[model samples]
Target: VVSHFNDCPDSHTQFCFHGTCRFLVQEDKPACVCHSGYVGARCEHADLLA
Candidate 1:
């Protein structure tokens, strides 16, 4: 099986941006986990009730 990078991927910057989300590995796949005030699978969306 393929392994994940120790750090966040470059694409996460364009997709996640700022501190909105952090790149991580989940279920053996690369993903972006949203932080506070952020929502969506890619964390590209903002929370209105944050």
Candidate 2:
């Protein structure tokens, strides 16, 4: 279970390049959220930003 997010850098601050990933509290579960320039439930996709 912990291995899921182990792919992130050692700083434990970055998940996807040119974007950000964080855990979002939803009801009683945690969801992976992505920021701009990224997509997908796991924030693994990169898209056009301009």
Candidate 3:
């Protein structure tokens, strides 16, 4: 993956983010995310969201 991001996957889930990756099987879209580091429906906003 890339820096500042990680991918978390469980037996039934998979998460990916620029700050802390944590995904669920149902959250395969780019909308799932955490707050404070980025912005956007998919957390792809520029300049950062913190």
Candidate 4:
């Protein structure tokens, strides 16, 4: 995909900025599993952890 974002099953785009995009069947949606020290809905926050 040229957009580079994942096409989630929930009709949304999964963009893991400082994290990884994971599709959890239990959650029934794509989730942004932020990297260490980074936390946010889409790993958009640094939180001074890094």
Which one is best on TM-score? 4
Off by over 4 Å in 3: 1-31, 47-49
Off by over 4 Å in 4: 1-14, 25-28
TM-score of 3: 0.30
Off by over 4 Å in 1: 1-5, 9-28
User: Would you list the clashing residue pairs of candidate 4?
Assistant: none
Worst 10 residues of 1 by lDDT: 14-23
Best by lDDT: 4
Please give, for residues 1-50, the per-residue lDDT of candidate 2 as tens digits: 55334333445465444455444323322334466567655556666572
Compute each candidate's TM-score over C-alphas. Answer: 0.41, 0.34, 0.30, 0.42
RMSD, one per candidate, in order: 5.6, 8.6, 8.9, 6.3
Please, what are the lDDT tens digits per residue for candidate 1 over residues 1-50? 45655555665455444243334566434445556887766566688899
Q: Model 2 scores what on Cα lDDT?
A: 0.48
Q: lDDT tens string, model 4, 2-46?
A: 453343555545457777666655556676667678877766778
lDDT of 1 at 48: 82
Residue-pair clashes per prediction, in order, are 0, 0, 3, 0
